[PDB]
Amino acid sequence: DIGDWFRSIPAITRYWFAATVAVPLVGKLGLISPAYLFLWPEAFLYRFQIWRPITATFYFPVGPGTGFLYLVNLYFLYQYSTRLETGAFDGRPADYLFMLLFNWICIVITGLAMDMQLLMIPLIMSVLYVWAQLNRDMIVSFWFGTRFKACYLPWVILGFNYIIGGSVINELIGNLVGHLYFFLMFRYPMDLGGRNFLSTPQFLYRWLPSRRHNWGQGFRLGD
Amino acid sequence: RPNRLIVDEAINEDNSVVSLSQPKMDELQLFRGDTVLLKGKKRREAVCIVLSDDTCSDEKIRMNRVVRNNLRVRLGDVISIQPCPDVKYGKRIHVLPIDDTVEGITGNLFEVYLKPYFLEAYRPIRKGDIFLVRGGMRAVEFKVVETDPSPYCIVAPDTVIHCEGEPIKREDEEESLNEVGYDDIGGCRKQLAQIKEMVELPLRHPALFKAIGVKPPRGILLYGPPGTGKTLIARAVANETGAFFFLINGPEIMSKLAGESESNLRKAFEEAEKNAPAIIFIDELDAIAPKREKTHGEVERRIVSQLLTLMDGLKQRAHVIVMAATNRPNSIDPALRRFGRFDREVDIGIPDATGRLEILQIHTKNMKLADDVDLEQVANETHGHVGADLAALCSEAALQAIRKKMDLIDLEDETIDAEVMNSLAVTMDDFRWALSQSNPSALRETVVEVPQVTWEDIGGLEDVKRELQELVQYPVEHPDKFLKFGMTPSKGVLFYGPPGCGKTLLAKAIANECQANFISIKGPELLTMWFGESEANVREIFDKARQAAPCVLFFDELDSIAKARGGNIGDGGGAADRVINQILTEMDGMSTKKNVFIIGATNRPDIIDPAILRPGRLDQLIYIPLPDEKSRVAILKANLRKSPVAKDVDLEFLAKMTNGFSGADLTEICQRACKLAIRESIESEIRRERERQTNPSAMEVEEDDPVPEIRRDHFEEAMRFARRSVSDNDIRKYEMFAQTLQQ
Amino acid sequence: FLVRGGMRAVEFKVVETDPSPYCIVAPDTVIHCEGEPIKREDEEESLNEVGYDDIGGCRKQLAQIKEMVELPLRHPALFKAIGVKPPRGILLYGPPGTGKTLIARAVANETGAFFFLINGPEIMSKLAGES
Ligand SMILES: Nc1ncnc2c1ncn2[C@@H]1O[C@H](COP(=O)(O)OP(=O)(O)O)[C@@H](O)[C@H]1O
Ligand SMILES: Nc1ncnc2c1ncn2[C@@H]1O[C@H](COP(=O)(O)OP(=O)(O)O)[C@@H](O)[C@H]1O
Ligand SMILES: Nc1ncnc2c1ncn2[C@@H]1O[C@H](COP(=O)(O)OP(=O)(O)O)[C@@H](O)[C@H]1O
């Protein structure tokens, strides 16, 4: 099961799955230094510190602390990352590759400005929030939930993670950065103007191609 | 607006036709061959061609299943119609099949499905639609997934069809055209009119019944033999009106565990209560709710009383119709008949001779029969079959056409080419073979039908013919003058006369003339429950006649029980009164509103008990006499309906040598005369075949048999071996009884 | 190959030969019949279990069972493609000891199937509601 089902996951998402599961395993046993991944913002303001521009963006010391929190955010991702790929994203992976970088650089710059340490939840809920607005207008009702009306998901989910824990900064920034990107990528071109001045380079398409309907060959006209 | 109309189903398929009345097109600036735009719910558009219809009304438009499915509408809705004859020829069309229809087919689908479909049709197609093609052995549906120019295009003789690619996955908003509908039932024209009338209103417009404040139906009970198509009426009605058919079964409720069978019923009505207007089908009701005396345990007394408390809990809320199916309406618990529960009852009998033909043309629609199959012949010689049996006969005969062609497909591949499938054909040689090893399941069951005997099938006795006509037609066809006066039309007639004179033929003939059902109860059948078995049988037979009104019940050889009483002991004389008492008890209960006619035949009129003959019951005495001369030749003509052309037969000469015989004996004479003629022709061909042993194929002229040349001397020689069946003592006994009754 | 013995049927195995592999036995040849016998390996079915040549007195009835069951069990895919309904229950009836569970054991062993017998007395008497 572990073999084929993991391969059944799309390579882009399966790579995200591998990154999110392998790191906590090393942390719980503790081979590498747990303190080696902290992302000191003040050190960045003084020195470039090319050691950790990316390393602390996937590390999380899950365990006796916020153990339950890591499980759930990974859980909605697993239950909903697959869904959103199937939603208007199968034929455009290069576009779906792009905005993943856009939120990641947006949260870290706001993250480097302030003094938080673990930007784990923001990168999960940002894309999850982007899913909701770009995939609105369905009713969902799970077994232990209520019969809340459609298009309420981004707001009802927003309160849930906020009240469990804290750190008001990360929840607020992740939603608004999705909000502005939702307005910029989707709403801005036909609102006033300012079209897609973020076009993905051909190098991205060269690495991973898009999908086009293969016509094939037409038999004949008949008669 | 002169655009919105009501829709209804068609007959002549033709996935791109609609039937409209002539004045409607005349006033809507429409002309022949004009393509039109049809628009309905969900902003869906279908393009069709219009043509005139003979019997189409103004506000009703006739269209088949496929056009309705594209528009996402149902029966009796409203559509938008507008002429747009400005379509531009398409260039390249990309048509692909649906995934769950081409399992293991492959081959070239273009040249055996699409090629004969678009050829010389100029079909106008629109993007996103679905059409169904009757294949060689299957029915494969396609989906126009791309067109150029988009989306309106008419298929032209110069168009490039790109029919390659993986099949499209089935989406969720379709209704799966390959499912049951109102056109998938035959032989149930009247019953499907009743079910559709009582159900279409509570299920299509639930809101109206709340404002009107009247009581909707809450239970329908269909009964009949197994295999006659009951759970197909419940599946057809739910699929067309739009509902949430939720089947619960008989056996799997009774065998879950201990006390949790009940929690299966309690949570079965829950989905139907929160899932829109629903319909619940409880199959095999007699398995879970039998009579109180056959429930020997306790946990079978818990299920029944759990079914009753759930039915009485259906007071308005959502509209939920619960229908049940049972084999015999006597085996159901009597508590499931009170009002608020199963009250409306429908009967699905076995099909008749014109019904068995319609089941044939439904199941064989997919196959490709050869040009020698006479479906009329197979229909009329399969009495005793139910709907489900004729669906196996048409399958066994299909298997021969591949069993005898197995070499062509020797091990093939995992997928079978479509070219060979369209090359197959089924002949009478297969159908006669599948008929041999078939076991019909109806057999011993009382058949209710309109017999085909005509007046001309009996000769003479026209005075009796007028007499019976007076007592049947006039009381029901012209009742107004009977309404005046306290006239009581006769409820019965008794026939008495010499045996074998044509009593049963008269009762059959009158039923055919009035076009009413006929039910016959024989003598030996009447003594079947006379001993041991209770008199419950004699009850349902009258209820059987009651439901099929109008009908002509027939009691044959009524004096059978009296003869058994007459004997050395006749200990059953009181027992012989049992059946008579029950017959008497259930003969005075008939109402004048329902039209039921009782006819009893007898041959010992002096032995019938005086209790039966009484005013208010069967009381008209009719004496059937032996046919006389000119009438006695008409009996002989009743066997000339065969082909006994005996040269210059001179039937008038044959008339004068046939003096003083009975009725049924004369037909035996023709059969006896014909029997030796068949035998004599055997020696002629036996002589011919053994003479051909000398000459090898020396036949310049093609002739194998003397071609039935029936002779008169051969007929005459048989008549010499004939004796009179008329007994002088017997006819004298009746005539003096006739005079005694006369005077 | 199977050799018919005095009271049994002993089946041997040509495990080694020379010159390999086609070597017809000749009136001047060497046979080495000594050694520990080979374990009965898997895959192949034994040559001693039931077959169509192990029934007699039922040449007609075994013709009806064979034509009705040979097609669904040998070509499972063809019935899917043509889409006709196959047989789904056969009821053999007769006196006990006439060879009924031997007609249903020869059909499985010849067409190729997974004969899975369930018994009457053993199902009926397991335990209360666990049966
Ligand atoms: N017009 C028809 N009338 C009766 N039976 C039909 C008709 N058309 C098809 N059938 C057959 O009836 C079968 C379904 O009826 P069935 O489920 O046996 O009802 P029940 O279970 O009440 O006996 C189908 O297999 C179908 O082949
Ligand atoms: N007009 C007729 N008169 C007399 N016999 C007839 C006439 N038409 C047909 N028959 C023959 O008489 C027979 C009728 O027998 P039936 O009346 O059923 O016997 P029973 O009188 O004992 O009930 C039929 O077999 C039929 O061939
Ligand atoms: N051709 C045959 N016909 C009937 N019985 C046979 C035949 N050949 C062998 N038998 C005997 O029949 C036995 C199997 O019958 P059995 O297992 O009793 O079937 P069932 O239990 O259904 O009667 C075998 O032990 C075998 O000895």
From Swiss-Prot, chain A:
Membrane-traversing stretches:
14-29, 68-87, 93-113, 121-135, 153-164, 169-187
Give GO terms: molecular function aspect only: ATPase binding; identical protein binding; MHC class I protein binding; protease binding; protein-containing complex binding; signal recognition particle binding; signaling receptor activity; ubiquitin protein ligase binding
InterPro entries annotated for this entry?
Answer: DER1 (IPR007599), Rhomboid-like_sf (IPR035952)
- The protein in question is named Derlin-1
Q: Which of the residues bear the PTM Phosphoserine? A: 199
The record's comment on protein family reads: Belongs to the derlin family.
On subunit structure and binding partners, the annotation says: Homotetramer. The four subunits of the tetramer are arranged in a twofold symmetry. Forms heterooligomers with DERL2 and DERL3; binding to DERL3 is poorer than that between DERL2 and DERL3. Interacts (via SHP-box motif) with VCP. Interacts with AMFR, SELENOS, SEL1L, SELENOK and SYVN1, as well as with SEL1L-SYVN1 and VCP-SELENOS protein complexes; this interaction is weaker than that observed between DERL2 and these complexes. Interacts with NGLY1 and YOD1. Does not bind to EDEM1. Interacts with DNAJB9. Interacts with RNF103. Interacts with HM13. (Microbial infection) Interacts with the cytomegalovirus US11 protein.
UniProt-reported outcome of changing residue 178 to V: Reduces interaction with and proteolysis of XBP1 isoform 1
Could you list which ranges are Cytoplasmic topological domains? 1-13, 88-92, 136-152
**Where is the protein situated, by its record's location annotation?**
Endoplasmic reticulum membrane
Name the residue ranges of motif: SHP-box. Answer: 214-221
Q: Which tissues express it? A: Ubiquitous.
What keywords were assigned to this record? Acetylation, Endoplasmic reticulum, Host-virus interaction, Membrane, Phosphoprotein, Protein transport, Transmembrane, Transmembrane helix, Transport, Unfolded protein response
Give the record's GO CC terms: Derlin-1 retrotranslocation complex; Derlin-1-VIMP complex; early endosome; endoplasmic reticulum; endoplasmic reticulum membrane; endoplasmic reticulum quality control compartment; late endosome; membrane
Task: Give the sites modified to Phosphothreonine.
Answer: 200
Main location group = endoplasmic reticulum
Matches recorded under PANTHER family: DER1-LIKE PROTEIN, DERLIN (PTHR11009)
The UniProt function text for this chain reads:
Functional component of endoplasmic reticulum-associated degradation (ERAD) for misfolded lumenal proteins. Forms homotetramers which encircle a large channel traversing the endoplasmic reticulum (ER) membrane. This allows the retrotranslocation of misfolded proteins from the ER into the cytosol where they are ubiquitinated and degraded by the proteasome. The channel has a lateral gate within the membrane which provides direct access to membrane proteins with no need to reenter the ER lumen first. May mediate the interaction between VCP and the misfolded protein. (Microbial infection) In case of infection by cytomegaloviruses, it plays a central role in the export from the ER and subsequent degradation of MHC class I heavy chains via its interaction with US11 viral protein, which recognizes and associates with MHC class I heavy chains. Also participates in the degradation process of misfolded cytomegalovirus US2 protein.
Top-level taxon of origin: Eukaryota
From Swiss-Prot, chain C:
Q: Which organism is it from?
A: Homo sapiens (Human)
Subunit comment for this entry? Homohexamer. Forms a ring-shaped particle of 12.5 nm diameter, that displays 6-fold radial symmetry. Part of a ternary complex containing STX5A, NSFL1C and VCP. NSFL1C forms a homotrimer that binds to one end of a VCP homohexamer. The complex binds to membranes enriched in phosphatidylethanolamine-containing lipids and promotes Golgi membrane fusion. Binds to a heterodimer of NPLOC4 and UFD1, binding to this heterodimer inhibits Golgi-membrane fusion. Interaction with VCIP135 leads to dissociation of the complex via ATP hydrolysis by VCP.
> Reported effect of changing residue 32 to W?
Severely reduced binding to DERL1
Write the gene name. VCP
Similarity field: Belongs to the AAA ATPase family.
Q: Where in the cell is it found?
A: Cytoplasm, Cytosol; Endoplasmic reticulum; Nucleus; Cytoplasm, Stress granule
Q: Where are the transmembrane segments?
A: none
- What residues bind ATP 1, as annotated? 96-102
> What's the protein called, per UniProt?
Transitional endoplasmic reticulum ATPase
How does it get modified post-translation? Phosphorylated by tyrosine kinases in response to T-cell antigen receptor activation. Phosphorylated in mitotic cells. ISGylated.
